[PDB]
């Protein structure tokens, strides 16, 4: 089997991408944030504290003839941005782009943190990291991809995120028309539960490539590119007037600037992030200070190849017995 679904930016900055997901019988379609940095499929629901729902579409398990309470199971998650959610668990039929999994754990939120409530466009998350990170207790549950894998034509999914445009998540096949050149595959460590890999270096604009190992994660659920402070300083030094602002929370730059590209290495191959992809717009409405799309990871503990980096590539998440990642230009 295969599946193919369009993923759409939630706003004009590409802050996140939403993909329609069919849950239950009859189908309830929710728009979920596919997140290769986490491993829970959780949704706003008829159980979510009413004051914490503000425009989201909810899953109502009592209206699904295939929903079953997973007795005793609870979940609770905290994300790298400080947001969180928790609740109970149903199993139900879940379909993405024509690919159907029966008995998928659907984590129904009883509580969500304010950042979720305040984002009316995201109805939940669909985790695509390794199932070892799933938070369901006392019996950990499998991700959608883990449940689907054996049925897929090939045990892979691909992320093709658009810049200011829709893109595609495919399951079970690699669309050879969706990229240019060849796909370069690179090793993955699953020891932290992530799609963790090592970039071979970077370049700023037309500058020389610096060969240096940068360990980080491929994370579709993170907006920006978080890299070591040395790398980030070298990038922003090429933007007149850019500076790190402790009060804003990162590098800012004059909105009048033209940003240089940023290249990262995948083996001997190179992925070029155009400068425009690094502009996240005014820090507040009407400001002429703009927020940068490349930020320091120093306070995180891990480097993160988020959407800024991934949307410059066609990305293969190869879930074979020994997982690997593939990157192609497009």
191: helix, strand or coil: coil
Please tell me which residue in 35, 40, 146, 307 is annotated as part of the active site: 35
Is the bond into 26 cis (omega within 30 degrees of 0)?
A: yes
147's CB contacts (< 8 A; 6+ apart) are 101, 103, 104
Instruction: Fill in the DSSP letter of residue 189.
Output: B
Please tell me which residue in 39, 45, 108, 199 is annotated as part of the active site: 199
Half-sphere exposure of 323 (CA within 13 A, CB side): 24
φ, ψ at 318 (rounded to 5°): -95, 110
Annotated catalytic residue 12: no
Give me 310's structure tokens: 């991934």
Annotated catalytic residue 45: no
Kind plus residue range of the DSSP H or E element containing 145: helix 144-148
Residue 187: name the closest of 309, 293, 318 by CA: 318
φ, ψ at 131 (rounded to 5°): -65, -15
Strands 294-296, 210-218: pairing kind:
unpaired
Catalytic residue numbers?
35, 199
């Amino acid at each position: 089997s295969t599946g193919s679904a369009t993923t759409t930016p939630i706003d004009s900055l590409d802050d996140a991408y939403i993909t329609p997901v069919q849950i239950g019988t009859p189908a309830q379609t929710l728009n979920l944030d596919f997140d290769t940095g986490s491993s829970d499929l959780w949704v706003f629901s008829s159980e979510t504290t009413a004051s914490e729902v503000d425009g989201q579409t909810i899953y109502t398990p009592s209206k699904s003839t295939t929903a079953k309470l997973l007795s005793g199971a609870t979940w609770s998650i905290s994300y790298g941005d400080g947001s969180s959610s928790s609740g109970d668990v149903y199993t139900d039929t879940v379909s993405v782009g024509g690919l159907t999994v029966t008995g998928q754990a659907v984590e129904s939120a009883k509580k969500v943190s304010s950042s979720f409530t305040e984002d009316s466009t995201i109805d939940g998350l669909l985790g695509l990291a390794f199932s070892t990170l799933n938070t369901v207790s006392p019996t950990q549950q499998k991700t959608f991809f883990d449940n689907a894998k054996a049925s897929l034509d090939s045990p892979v999914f691909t992320a093709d995120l658009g810049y200011h445009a829709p893109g595609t998540y495919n399951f079970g096949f690699i669309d050879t028309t969706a990229y240019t050149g060849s796909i370069t595959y690179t090793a993955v460590s699953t020891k932290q539960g992530f799609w963790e890999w090592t970039s071979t270096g970077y370049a700023v604009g037309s500058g020389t490539f610096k060969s240096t190992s940068i360990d980080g994660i491929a994370d579709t659920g993170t907006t920006l590119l978080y890299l070591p402070a040395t790398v980030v300083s070298a990038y922003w030094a090429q933007v007149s007037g850019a500076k790190s602002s402790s009060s804003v929370g990162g590098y800012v730059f004059p909105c009048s600037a033209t940003l240089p590209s940023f290249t990262f290495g995948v083996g001997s191959a190179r992925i070029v992030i155009p400068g425009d992809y690094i502009d996240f717009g005014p820090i507040s409405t009407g400001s002429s200070s703009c927020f940068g799309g490349i930020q320091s990871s120093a306070g995180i503990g891990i480097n993160i190849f988020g959407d800024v980096a991934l949307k410059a590539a066609f990305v293969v998440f190869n879930g074979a017995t020994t997982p690997t990642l593939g990157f192609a230009s497009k």
